[PDB]
RNA sequence: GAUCUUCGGAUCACUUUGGUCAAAUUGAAACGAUACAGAGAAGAUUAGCAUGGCCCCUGCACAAGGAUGACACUGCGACAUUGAGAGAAAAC
Protein backbone atom coordinates (compact mmCIF):
# COMPACT_ATOMS: atom_id res chain seq x y z
CA UNK A 1 0.00 0.00 0.00
CA UNK A 2 3.13 2.37 -0.79
CA UNK A 3 4.72 3.54 -3.78
CA UNK A 4 7.06 1.24 -5.53
CA UNK A 5 10.84 1.67 -5.43
CA UNK A 6 13.36 1.26 -7.78
CA UNK A 7 15.66 -1.71 -7.27
CA UNK A 8 18.83 -0.63 -9.12
CA UNK A 9 20.26 3.14 -8.94
CA UNK A 10 22.17 2.22 -11.97
CA UNK A 11 22.01 1.28 -15.66
CA UNK A 12 23.27 -1.51 -16.97
CA UNK A 13 25.81 -0.67 -19.87
CA UNK A 14 26.47 -2.76 -22.30
CA UNK A 15 30.39 -3.36 -23.01
CA UNK A 16 31.97 -6.79 -23.21
CA UNK A 17 33.64 -9.15 -26.15
CA UNK A 18 33.32 -12.73 -25.82
CA UNK A 19 36.61 -14.75 -26.83
CA UNK A 20 38.73 -11.38 -27.46
CA UNK A 21 41.21 -12.92 -30.34
CA UNK A 22 37.82 -14.92 -32.59
CA UNK A 23 34.79 -12.69 -31.94
CA UNK A 24 34.23 -9.75 -34.19
CA UNK A 25 30.91 -8.10 -33.67
CA UNK A 26 28.30 -7.63 -36.56
CA UNK A 27 26.52 -4.50 -36.99
CA UNK A 28 23.94 -5.52 -38.82
CA UNK A 29 22.60 -9.01 -36.31
CA UNK A 30 23.61 -6.88 -33.28
CA UNK A 31 26.25 -9.58 -31.62
CA UNK A 32 29.35 -10.77 -32.21
CA UNK A 33 30.08 -14.18 -34.59
CA UNK A 34 33.40 -15.63 -35.38
CA UNK A 35 35.05 -18.00 -33.13
CA UNK A 36 34.02 -21.16 -31.54
CA UNK A 37 29.95 -21.52 -31.40
CA UNK A 38 31.46 -22.30 -27.58
CA UNK A 39 27.58 -23.79 -26.55
CA UNK A 40 24.24 -23.94 -27.43
CA UNK A 41 23.64 -23.62 -23.14
CA UNK A 42 27.15 -23.30 -21.59
CA UNK A 43 26.76 -18.93 -22.13
CA UNK A 44 24.54 -18.67 -19.00
CA UNK A 45 25.37 -15.95 -16.52
CA UNK A 46 23.40 -15.72 -13.09
CA UNK A 47 21.06 -13.03 -12.79
CA UNK A 48 22.67 -10.66 -10.58
CA UNK A 49 19.64 -9.75 -9.06
CA UNK A 50 16.48 -11.00 -7.75
CA UNK A 51 13.09 -9.32 -7.09
CA UNK A 52 10.01 -10.41 -4.56
CA UNK A 53 7.26 -8.49 -4.18
CA UNK A 54 6.98 -8.32 -0.46
CA UNK A 55 9.56 -5.27 -0.63
CA UNK A 56 9.63 -4.14 -4.07
CA UNK A 57 5.66 -3.86 -4.91
CA UNK A 58 3.91 -0.97 -4.87
CA UNK A 59 2.08 2.14 -6.70
CA UNK A 60 3.35 3.33 -10.22
CA UNK A 61 2.01 5.66 -12.56
CA UNK A 62 0.62 2.76 -15.29
CA UNK A 63 -1.94 1.89 -12.04
CA UNK A 64 -4.14 4.40 -14.05
CA UNK A 65 -4.65 2.50 -16.84
CA UNK A 66 -7.06 -0.06 -17.42
CA UNK A 67 -5.36 -1.83 -20.01
CA UNK A 68 -1.54 -1.35 -18.54
CA UNK A 69 1.16 -4.40 -18.80
CA UNK A 70 3.62 -5.47 -16.35
CA UNK A 71 7.57 -4.09 -16.22
CA UNK A 72 9.66 -6.35 -18.08
CA UNK A 73 12.64 -5.01 -15.52
CA UNK A 74 10.48 -5.56 -12.32
CA UNK A 75 10.18 -9.12 -12.68
CA UNK A 76 14.04 -9.51 -13.71
CA UNK A 77 14.17 -7.25 -10.92
CA UNK A 78 16.37 -4.04 -12.26
CA UNK A 79 12.80 -1.68 -12.96
CA UNK A 80 15.31 1.53 -12.25
CA UNK A 81 12.48 3.92 -12.75
CA UNK A 82 10.47 3.38 -9.57
CA UNK A 83 6.66 4.77 -9.15
CA UNK A 84 7.53 6.69 -12.39
C1' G B 1 -2.47 36.52 -26.10
C1' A B 2 -3.13 40.52 -31.28
C1' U B 3 -7.03 43.07 -33.79
C1' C B 4 -11.07 45.83 -33.82
C1' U B 5 -15.73 46.64 -31.02
C1' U B 6 -18.36 49.39 -27.37
C1' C B 7 -17.65 47.14 -22.50
C1' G B 8 -23.24 42.81 -25.21
C1' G B 9 -18.93 40.82 -28.17
C1' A B 10 -16.61 39.80 -32.79
C1' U B 11 -12.75 38.15 -35.21
C1' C B 12 -7.12 34.67 -35.70
C1' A B 13 -5.33 29.62 -34.93
C1' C B 14 -8.25 23.86 -33.59
C1' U B 15 -6.35 17.06 -31.47
C1' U B 16 0.83 14.83 -32.40
C1' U B 17 2.83 10.08 -31.33
C1' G B 18 6.31 5.32 -38.77
C1' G B 19 5.83 1.52 -34.08
C1' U B 20 11.69 -6.34 -36.05
C1' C B 21 7.79 -3.70 -31.53
C1' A B 22 10.34 -1.24 -23.43
C1' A B 23 17.88 -0.20 -20.79
C1' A B 24 21.56 -6.64 -25.34
C1' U B 25 21.14 -14.38 -21.46
C1' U B 26 15.31 -17.10 -23.04
C1' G B 27 11.52 -14.76 -30.47
C1' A B 28 16.65 -10.42 -37.44
C1' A B 29 21.22 -15.98 -39.86
C1' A B 30 24.66 -19.58 -40.32
C1' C B 31 28.35 -21.85 -38.41
C1' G B 32 34.11 -22.88 -36.02
C1' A B 33 36.59 -27.14 -34.59
C1' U B 34 37.54 -32.03 -33.53
C1' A B 35 36.54 -37.67 -35.04
C1' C B 36 34.87 -40.95 -39.65
C1' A B 37 34.72 -41.53 -45.29
C1' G B 38 37.25 -38.67 -48.24
C1' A B 39 36.72 -36.53 -56.11
C1' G B 40 30.99 -38.54 -62.26
C1' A B 41 30.53 -42.41 -67.59
C1' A B 42 30.85 -50.79 -66.99
C1' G B 43 40.28 -51.38 -66.35
C1' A B 44 43.25 -46.36 -65.64
C1' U B 45 43.63 -41.37 -66.14
C1' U B 46 40.39 -38.24 -67.01
C1' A B 47 36.80 -32.78 -71.45
C1' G B 48 32.37 -31.47 -70.74
C1' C B 49 26.40 -30.24 -72.31
C1' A B 50 22.09 -31.61 -70.71
C1' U B 51 17.04 -34.04 -68.07
C1' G B 52 13.56 -33.56 -62.64
C1' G B 53 12.42 -30.06 -58.61
C1' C B 54 9.46 -28.40 -51.18
C1' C B 55 18.20 -28.61 -52.93
C1' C B 56 20.69 -24.43 -53.40
C1' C B 57 25.25 -20.76 -53.58
C1' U B 58 28.12 -16.48 -56.49
C1' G B 59 26.26 -13.15 -59.97
C1' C B 60 23.12 -6.83 -62.48
C1' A B 61 21.94 -10.71 -65.52
C1' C B 62 17.08 -14.52 -69.80
C1' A B 63 25.87 -14.68 -69.80
C1' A B 64 28.52 -17.90 -67.05
C1' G B 65 30.29 -20.46 -62.90
C1' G B 66 30.12 -23.47 -58.16
C1' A B 67 33.16 -31.65 -58.77
C1' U B 68 29.83 -32.13 -65.82
C1' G B 69 27.34 -27.40 -58.64
C1' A B 70 24.93 -31.35 -55.56
C1' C B 71 21.07 -35.20 -55.24
C1' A B 72 18.38 -38.52 -58.39
C1' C B 73 18.50 -42.07 -63.27
C1' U B 74 14.66 -49.49 -61.98
C1' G B 75 12.17 -53.19 -62.67
C1' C B 76 7.38 -54.41 -61.84
C1' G B 77 1.92 -58.84 -62.07
C1' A B 78 -6.17 -55.35 -65.33
C1' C B 79 -1.96 -63.45 -65.48
C1' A B 80 -6.10 -65.87 -68.01
C1' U B 81 -5.05 -70.26 -66.09
C1' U B 82 -5.87 -74.96 -68.32
C1' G B 83 -2.84 -79.16 -70.03
C1' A B 84 -2.77 -83.45 -67.46
C1' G B 85 -1.94 -87.19 -63.54
C1' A B 86 -1.91 -89.11 -58.27
C1' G B 87 -3.36 -90.11 -53.35
C1' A B 88 -7.95 -88.15 -50.84
C1' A B 89 -12.33 -86.55 -50.75
C1' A B 90 -17.83 -86.51 -52.00
C1' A B 91 -19.14 -87.45 -57.86
C1' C B 92 -18.88 -89.24 -62.99
K1 LIG C 1 35.79 -33.52 -65.20
MG1 LIG D 1 27.12 -25.40 -64.91
MG1 LIG E 1 24.73 -30.13 -63.13
Redesign the pocket.
Known sequence: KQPARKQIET??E?EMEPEQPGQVY?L????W?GG???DPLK??????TRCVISRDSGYTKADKNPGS?????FARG????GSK
Open positions: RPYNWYNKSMRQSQVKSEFFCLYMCSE
